[model samples]
Target: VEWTPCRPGGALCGKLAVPVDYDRPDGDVAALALIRFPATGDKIGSLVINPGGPGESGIEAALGVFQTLPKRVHERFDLVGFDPRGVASSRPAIWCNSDADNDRLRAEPQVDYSREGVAHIENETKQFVGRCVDKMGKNFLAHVGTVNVAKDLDAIRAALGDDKLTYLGYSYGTRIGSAYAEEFPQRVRAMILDGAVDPNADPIEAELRQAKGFQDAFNNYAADCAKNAGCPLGADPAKAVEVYHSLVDPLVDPDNPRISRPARTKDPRGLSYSDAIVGTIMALYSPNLWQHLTDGLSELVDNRGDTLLALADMYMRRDSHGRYNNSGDARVAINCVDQPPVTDRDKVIDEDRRAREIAPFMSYGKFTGDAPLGTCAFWPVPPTSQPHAVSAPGLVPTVVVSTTHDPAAPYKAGVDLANQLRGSLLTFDGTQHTVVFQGDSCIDEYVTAYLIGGTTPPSGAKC
Candidate 1:
């Protein structure tokens, strides 16, 4: 594919071509789209920022949040955003067959996983994966692994003529950062991994942990809702929990009346009550939107459905044109490629059982497990590699930030990632995806000091 400049004002943009298959360097070529925001003064180094999703376009994120960086860091280092291979603007962008296909997958009812139900789920999973692979093709499907992305990052650093990589990553981007450090430990300058995913956990374990994390966040919300005067569940926490569960419980039945609304562009077309619940749970991951959830729940218990529907619409990211931004498709492609499930059908079942047992209310038996598993099961091509840990030994001083309650990336994951990276300092006591962007002055001071001055925060710092 040809490379085109995508940045505003035609800021520097180019493509760095690499092998489609790293194992076979001469097989095919893939291009990574790169955009740079150069420093006005003497440059300290180039810092590459990747917003997670494994599929989130770094160029888009840079455009959205680059200006928020501290002026000193901005003036001292050029900021770069490059689309990882298989993602937007990069060659061989991963696409499903159609928006309708994607909508069906996203809106499908949760598989019950009973003896008969398991057979149905397996068939659906295989079909979904097959369709995605057919649409994406073997070349792109086989090469879009995390390891390859890390290798591409190194090539990007070389193309930009940077001796070392200074980086900031959130969510899945943390895994990318960790992989970069592992492969090129000597080339690290300074890095920050906010709301980190643990490099040590496999995909199944990771998702299970995430399920519990969301439950934890919900419980926290529940407690807060009980105390807050505006809480819709009433002054009693027990009653609130009962009310919340009641709203979600009815969806388990196939005949629920709410399921009748034909899924719109935002709501999964042919959506079931279970689909709506899954959508609701997914939205609770963002703390900034917790108020909307509280209001929705309140309204639901009061027999007011409008608020809940609005929350679903927002979670779906539907545009006025009955289309969606690339988030859902991108999420599927990247997640499937990055963390394919264990191939053994029985193992997958056993794992699902374990997950359900551990967090019965919010486990793999619920929602996310099905999506990831279905993608893997139906994926046309086999995964290029399995999930593995990244250890960046003797690298640059890195600052790892953790929150007390991060639904997406649990706080423990941050701690584990920090422990894996040598000379990395850990910061705690925040509540959000990434504390740096959550308006914490202390985090700002520490991050700015490190990015601009090359200083590390204290070992057990709280930000």
Candidate 2:
């Protein structure tokens, strides 16, 4: 791998060929795209990073981290980011649909859980699965799991000439990091896993936890709004849930026009009810973006959805030209292969009702009716990994950061991962996902010190 200087902070860009199927070492290979921000001062080693989405571009995240992380980190270590197999910039990327198709799908109205609606969604999902298999072959799709990603990371570490791995992973990236630890415990130098996914929880439990997490985050947002004048959800925090339902319930009500008609937007495309919900979840990831959600909701009151649509676009990685990156496609493709798919309709229906019961704001209808089987149910390949505790004996003590009210990966998941890995748990008493290196002095110090000197914080540390 020959490194060359690239745009966006003059980071060094490179690619290393790794086996698509590690079981067959001499088989087809995939080029893992990499971007490195070199150390300003004497370098320790390459500190690899993965910014969550499971499909998020690590190269893109490297640029953001370079801009945001303290100068000390840049001066002491070369920050490296790599696109996992089947992700952005990597060859043979997972592409389910074209930009036009995605645009059309986003513009479609939300689906209710009626029998016909459920069947319709199931058919749509089957088509999507077929499309993915048609684009990326079955062999490629089967190998894009977290276990393979962890192996690729090891290959990357060796290519970078590093003796041991130093990593900082967020959200789904933490799952990658945990798998790496489980596979190569002796090769870890230092690690920080933020917004971790629980190894013990199955798919349904994960969904349930996430719904509750989002609900808590919304509650926090509403409470904060109550302290301000002219809040969209109103001055009464107690009535915030009711206000929210009143605002979005029409989108699903059979008699309401919003059920089929999308809200108007400044752009040629209209904002579908699903996009509004997506935008709301996107904003809940960070308190900094809560204002955007509030403003979008306010505009939504007047039947305008420009702000909300913009937020939704950001979440979906949709560019202004109506083009999209393959992140969304890769997210589903990679996840389906990483976790076992829940194909039982009854189980899906039960989880659907539980999700609504815990998070009423995200509910589409009162009844769970007939839950549509997700795309994962029709996955081309069986899951390569399962939900189990990671026990990496002799692994170095690492740091696991978790936010108190993280909407995506709940705080408890972080605690569970920390316990599983026998690592220190750093608690950030805030309402955001992945707090490290995001302008939090204490959290930054905890992570930066460990990454630099390989010293973990005490068992229980808080910021």
Candidate 3:
């Protein structure tokens, strides 16, 4: 049968159906937004792809990379993409209170974590958390965790009439996939979790590790910046580092108060200095965007804030239309719900302080203290369940890919996830998210062979 859009070809398409909240099977119902690209050849299985970001819509990602996969892979499987619950187009989408307000917050210079800076950050954190909780409410907000999304995937599988699921997940989506593997091991036919997050690690610890990962990536950027003849940071990479920090320090104690809230801005969440640095770190995750990082840093060193501003603009995904997508809002919501705040606030603060003392150059310390902690503090609901470990007892052999320099889902995460799954093959020594689909013929050939011929790659494969 020729593949056709689930809806009319080329038109925006959708289906509406209610899914029971697994926790409250007898109570309220939630909706799932499903988009399907049918198999053009012999139907092999259902392959569902999830792009990272608890809030990023899979439908958009699917459309973005519609033709990137091997022709055989597409011809044999129904490529399904979904907007996870609480994402854009998903019923009960979690939107920011106001795009303008969030935009203004993003625009503000991030704060350094000095004593006075911490005080300012605490106030801002409280306000942002309070507003989100008040607007979204706890019932819906709490239900956005990865576990819930995992169950939602099961619902999607059932709706598609598939006995088992084949999945390709990247970054945060790896968590979603891991959770599913843990919950429904038997239902997994073939799973590829790239840029995996260790399922058992505490959320805060994971984030701290990620912070360090970004720092490492920044140092790598420093070396690259120094090497490039066009590098704006100049030949001395350390000097470039100093120049970068110099640009941020003043924002902590600006000469004019009005600059803190600069006029005609839409970012209103009042970004702390850490937020700005964190945003910069995020842009460095992809090598393709590394030049943008260098350029942004270069412009900042030259006293031109436009490039950094533009980088921030891209990171925040702000469009000229004044409407904002739910990326940041969804990231926080899902992150908070999946991992509730630990009861000891002081302990978390102490840890942040200690991290800063050990790695001053990299640690935004108190600036990041609120990310995991404050998120749950303001979350409308608490986590209902925490993950244990994945046990794919009887599932078919699966292949897991890892990248040595993955900023988001480090290589160790893939190794850990592979160890947990039964009969799983692991691949590493690459530098990309979900390696198979990111233009590696070798990796793609291996993965495609498995999907088409059920031939798993040899153990310890490297590409």
Candidate 4:
């Protein structure tokens, strides 16, 4: 792992060639892209981080963490971020759709759970995945799951000459952390998992819980909106959801003859119902963005659609130039191989029905008949992992951080992860996704202390 300049004077970049399939150690190798911010002071080994996209570029995350986190923390540890196989900056990266194709897919008309609608979506998924396999080949798809990612983490730890692993994982990254702990408990020195994905929940159950989490976050946002003057939804807290419906319902409601198309934007492309839902859901991830949601919705009231469309574009990783970051393709690819496919039509429809019921605002049209099969159904390879409880009996006591109203990873999942790992739980009473070292001094202090010295947060500590 020879490092070269990644930035002007600071960070270094390198690659580690790890086997794509651990079962065959001498087989094909994946050159994982890695970036490092060397310690400013006397160094303790590297502190590897995964910023939770499963597809998020860790090399970029390393640079951001170096700039944002306290100097004292960086002084004692070299920060390392690695792009997992098939993710950003890594060899064999997932490349599926063109920029124009991605835009077309996002802006497609909102479809129902009817036979024709399902067929339309299923065909799109099939085509998109076919492109991925055609480009990156089949082996990359077969071993790109979390189990292999955990193995990659161990190999990374060894390459850094760290006798034991020190790590931080967020959201889907937690899946990798838990897997690592399960596989190599004796090698872990310290770990912190925030916004955890519960290993115990099956794919369908996880999606339903995520929908409920978003609904809860939306309710919290509405409560805040009710207290403010000139609130777009209304002064009454209870009617906020209803007010929201009135604003967005026309976008997909065929029965509403008054509205001919989705809301018009400054650009040629109007705000499609799909984009509207995505834009609204994106805001729920952070309370800081609540104003944007309000303004976006306010604009919707005036029949304008720039803010919402921009937010939706951000969620999709689209740039103003219309090129995507490619993480979107990687996310879908990684997820398909990590979770077992729910190919059964009846089960898929049942989960879809439950999700709509849980988060009505997210749902657009009527469910006329059948539900579309997901992309995983057409995945070229079988999943390497299953939804089961994780156990690492001999592991050191790690730290698990959970936001009370996290919009994507629910608080309960964090609790479940903490329990499974026998790790201390740090609860944050906030409405955001992952909140460790992200402007919360209390969380930063606790997490830094744990990372620096094997000191876990106090029992039942909440910030």
Candidate 5:
């Protein structure tokens, strides 16, 4: 309940003091880190924003994104961003283990998780879970779920003296907004949910859907890149996957002489198949990163894997100096706590096989399993949340934006979210993660109009 002008660019940074457990508001206390870019004109309360990592820092985003917002939006609302508890800058931020453990993890040799291979993965997961519990503390892990995060939003809304929350949430943050609307339906003034995740997806389905989405994006990228020279995947778009396999397969093998550089004869702290695939997948999320993806792949073909490694490190929040920002740890801790675990290896393998058939270019086999499930099977605590419909009846009409060819959330998730929330759907027929403020004037107008004037677009509106 205190404020300060501490963050860079003169942004006001402070903490929102609240109870760690909503049930005992007076007994135990916690504080969420916050930064506000004050309104330049007639302020209409705070426009809270979250850029959806469940691990990503919204405060950092707030500082930069304010510049991109329109004059009308800038003058009408005090944009605020906060770190969800157990995330960066928040009190008692969760750190899973030592930097050494994090360092060791990046280069961990990936194996095809067959039946026994899954058991090995399960053991590793359990071991990691134990280490996380020991390192991050059980109490922090217990309360980091999205359910509690939504409660924190209410506290923030109340603190800002808003009768209802006007929010813009992207990706996983959509879940947080949906939860808030469900918990406080009457308090919702206006909201925009972009790059929505369907809360209805069980763990396996979520993984498979994302796999297909990324594959679609990758194929699109390949098709574009193939027409131009210097595309490592080559000029034949049809043979793009074959080209990828030919180049990447060799790097995954240590016995191969191609990657055996004199500078580093061994794979010590080196990039693996996970680095190449996941890094490339992360790059595929935004159209802006497409150029970088092509350049990285070109470098990969030349045995200079550092380009892809840089992309992978960027995704993982690993700095050039090898210090992790703990996003991976926080992401796992939060995701595992939200979704129910999938322990049966056969179910994982079967679903993975289905995903491969759907998107062979995106399939990293076990990496798909490594995604939604992650180490959830071995979490220290059970899931605090589960997949279900978000029915926030009586909440004001909200806007849900989706891209036609999104790599992460997929267009279907947005469709499902809009249907479930009974919010009007606005579709961007393009490739990218989120729509609003991503340069589509139509999407931006819809977002601004909804947040400032409470104008919801027509149902099933396509832009």
Candidate 6:
């Protein structure tokens, strides 16, 4: 392990090597990237944090946000973040494509679900599976699963000199947290999981919940938008819901009633209705950005899709430089390898239709596109993990934070996790994905108190 002060008079960053696969540690090793912000007040210990994505760089997220946290929280512990194995800033990191590769993939044709927009997606995913094997040796690619990362997290906890782990995780980060608790219950001091992944959700159920959650979020936004007369979505929230129908119906070529809304401007740059759907849903992760959604719809109404395009790019993490971060490849690599592959085309199309049946207000309308079913269906590696109970029997109490309308991870996952772990549950009555220090006084105060004092409110506390 080597340490360096990367920030100018600020946080410290380090690289520590760990075995890519713990079972065969002697064979190969990968370095985990780490960053730390020193405690300011009472040094309790290192409070390790992971931002979700299974692929998101916690090192970057902590460095970017930790300094601005409440003084008490920052001062109480050495804020730590790490780039898990095969992620960006870590050794042997997955290499995606440069500008041209994405350009070509973007230029890659769209499918109409014609028999197998199904077959089209399968072929594409299989090609990607080949790419993964080609990019790195099959043996090496197989070692990038969550198990390796959890072991690496143990190494991190040891490196930080914490007798037990005190951690925070959001979204997919919850998977790492749950795995840690399951594998190492004895190591936990006080951990917090926000925007939890439902370890028990099947693919069909996961898709349905996510689609419904986003729909609920969109309706909330629509009703709010309707309340503002200046909003592009008129006074009728119902029609505002229908307004989304007008914008997205033509893009997917769904056979539905013709909306009175005017013809949507064709995606000027080959951006599909799917892209708009993604862009729209991604923003619903946070309520503060809902007005931006209104602005995007306003842009769409004006026959300009730039705002929505930007949102899609944001979700994809494509920078202005046209170079994508490795997160995309890592997301696919980790997800496909961690869970079962969705290969059935009919099931795929059926899911697409089912998702829209309930939340037409979500994803514009009648959501249709090549689903992620393709990603894992043709993945080179078989699943190494699945949604299952994380039974940390007799483990210390942990805090599980959930929102009523969390779109990405879904609220039930949080509910179930708290029950499974026998931990305290903090409920936020809102529609955001992960919320812990983003100006929510109630959440932050509770979290900071727990971290500082090692106490959690009794089970089922509402924030």
Best model number under lDDT: 2
Query: How many backbone overlaps does candidate 6 show?
Result: 4
lDDT of 6 by residue, 1-463 (tens): 5677885336789999888667786988888889988888878888899998977899888976674588898888888899988899998887645556654454333434443554665566677677778877777678787866777888889998888889999888888888888888898888999998867777877878888888888878888888785777778877777777576555544552211222243433545565567678877988788877787778776656667767777887888766688888888788877777767866876787786686666533324554446667766667778767778796898888999888787788799888888888899989899888778888888998898887897666788
In candidate 5, position 222 carries an lDDT of 90
Query: Order of all candidates by TM-score, from best down to worst?
Result: 2, 4, 5, 6, 3, 1
**TM-score of each model, in listed order:** 0.86, 0.97, 0.87, 0.96, 0.93, 0.91
> Number of clashes in model 5?
0
Q: After superposition, how far is residue 271 of candidate 5 from its true place, in Å?
A: 2.9
Clash pairs for candidate 6: 40-75, 41-75, 116-119, 199-387
**Number of clashes in every candidate structure?**
3, 0, 15, 0, 0, 4
lDDT value, residue 202 of candidate 6: 79
Candidate models: Cα lDDT each = 0.69, 0.87, 0.68, 0.86, 0.79, 0.77
Preferred candidate (lDDT higher): 2 or 3: 2
Candidate 4: count of backbone clashes, pairs at least 3 residues apart or interchain: 0
Off by over 4 Å in 1: 1-12, 252-272, 302-317, 337-340, 357-374, 377-380, 387-389
lDDT per residue as tens, model 2, 1-463: 8999885775889999999988899999999999988888988898899997878999988888887887778888889999999999998789998898788777666556778778767877888888898888899999999999999999999999899998999999999999999999999989999999887788888899999999999999999988987888999988998988676655554674225566788898777778888899999999999999999888878878888899999999999888899999999999898888898999999998888889988887677457888889899799999988888988899889988899898989999899998899999998888887888888888787888877788867889
Off by over 4 Å in 3: 1-12, 112-116, 238-240, 250-279, 357-373, 423-425, 428-433
* Model 1 lDDT tens row, 152-254: 9888887778888888888888888888888898887888999888757876777777767776776777777778876775677656545665655554454
In candidate 3, where is summed lDDT lowest over 10 consecutive residues?
257-266
lDDT measured at residue 427 in model 4 versus the true structure, 0 to 100: 96
Report the CA-based lDDT of candidate 2 relative to the real structure: 0.87
Model 3 per-residue lDDT tens digits across residues 346-439:
7667667655644345543234444223545645577766656766566567677787877677677778777886545556563334566777
Q: Pick the candidate with the highest TM-score.
A: 2
